[PDB]
């Protein structure tokens, strides 16, 4: 039920006998996977986690100085000298100043003056690199089990039945994971962290308990003291003169000063930069998509063997409508019959009693055996006007529903979305290894690209007329000596035969 | 002010209070009267400015010099900070700018 | 708008009878556009028998 209130929602349907199915997850969207006999699953990607990041370089914005010393020699004495010059922690500058009898010595010429002082970095910022083997994605999996649909369980402490929700950590070390959903069964997932945001031109900047991402060509352009990442208590710095300003000159001395906090300059420069969050030493990124392949072999239903409900069904409120034309129904059941299957039908008139639409939640059932219980289901009403009927006998309830749009419009939109999805799955779509899975792959993707329109167009899914239409089209394409008329017709005929062979 | 000698050279630890007054001490040559005209002198704290100030003949006026003694050249040292708050002046106002992106 | 969706859903519900009526009305026009008008007549009267 985690995929109901999401703007970017897709719909993926696989072949009836097709166990494997590929999907793509975006960091701002969701994926709904449905089948004929399997329960509906909902996949979402929550956060990109970066951990164990190496350090590349560290800058020092605010610094201090101490123990300023100077030494002056006038002409006919050579260059000035100081013992602190050889130390890497003391920075000095040389210069030439005019001297005379007023300064101590006789010859009228300019001398050599040197001035150095200590350098201690009180505050600093750091830069880290990001490697693909460090990334770890987190995907939540929900199951449409006719849950109550109440948003009272935000965290992972409780109110989360372990057979209805699960969390999966996809790592670059082991991309193959086995998910256990309890009574529902087990699934397999193989996700490939590819085609994401490039991490070869990005640096993770940590500064004052805040974090940003910067460009590598810009990180080295900054003019501030720096030093690489070396584990030690005292580090050697380079290019610290950019933070220590020396005065013009003096006949006997030179007084240096240190610049103030450059935090404001960095905050102003990083205005148009991307931001992130961090916990301890780990970082969280909200950008990046993922490609996955699911194997659904041991997944089954939970209430397929249950009986029917002989109690009283009632609506709890007016059924709402989502942006994708889907209708959520919240039912309240009275009676004590235990877990029983919910008899619900969708038709065009109260006397017709003919299924006209499909259900997003397979096998709607009541979860508890209480007297007055509640449940929820999600369905897809047909375009136009429709009637939802719940129950049998003289106690069955009916409700009117309307939905705008056109079937051809939805079919074309779904076809274009499926084509875009198959285009995103450029690599790792087919297998060129052992033979026997190539025909399976071509059938699988032609299904995933054309079934949304096949189900919407070809009548009432009789599965008998469509085979005859395909056969007659194959015959019409066969008895044709002209070029470019037999190949396309035979291809369309085989496509229709296969699409009717799959689930409708 | 404190007067010491470390390695045949005289150091004069002068605090903030002795600012603008002369002081007499003793060297191997004899008595030495040394005047201090430090204008930017501060209180005692780790930030210590130290510079040698030279001997000169009394028949010449000081030019761009704020320390002078007459026995030899004497090394002066004094702290530079404000109100003993353990903080340097750091009043540079360079305002270095960084590229945006 | 109000009637197009209804007749579209009707056509998609039972396409066999609709195609039968269309091919019947196709051969009952004197001109091509006249055949189109004759089949659209059946298309319009299709939802309500009355
Ligand atoms: C330095 O000058 C003072 C000024 O009177 C004098 O008393 C002192 O003897 C001089 N020091 C010498 C000559 O070593």
Author numbering:
A (entry chain A): 1 to 504
B (entry chain B): 1 to 101
C (entry chain C): 120 to 169
According to the publication:
We obtained a 4.2 Å resolution map of the prM3E3 trimer and 3.8 Å resolution for monomeric prM1E1 composing the trimeric spikes. In the structure, the pr domain sits on top of the E protein, covering the fusion loop and burying a combined total surface area of ~3100 Å2. The RSRR furin recognition motif, which is critical for maturation, is found towards the end of the pr domain. Polar interactions between E residues (in particular Glu62 and Glu245) and positively charged residues on pr fix the position of the furin site. Furthermore, hydrophobic prM residues (Ile96 and Leu98) directly downstream of the furin site, bury into the surface of E, providing additional stabilization. The pr domain of prM connects to the membrane-associated M domain via a linker region encompassing residues 102–119. No density is observable for this region, possibly indicating high conformational dynamics. However, the last clearly visible residue prior to this flexible region is a histidine (His101), which is inserted in a hydrophobic pocket on E. Although the prM sequence is relatively diverse compared with that of E, His101 is highly conserved. A decrease in pH would lead to protonation of His101, destabilizing this residue in the hydrophobic pocket and promoting prM-E dissociation.
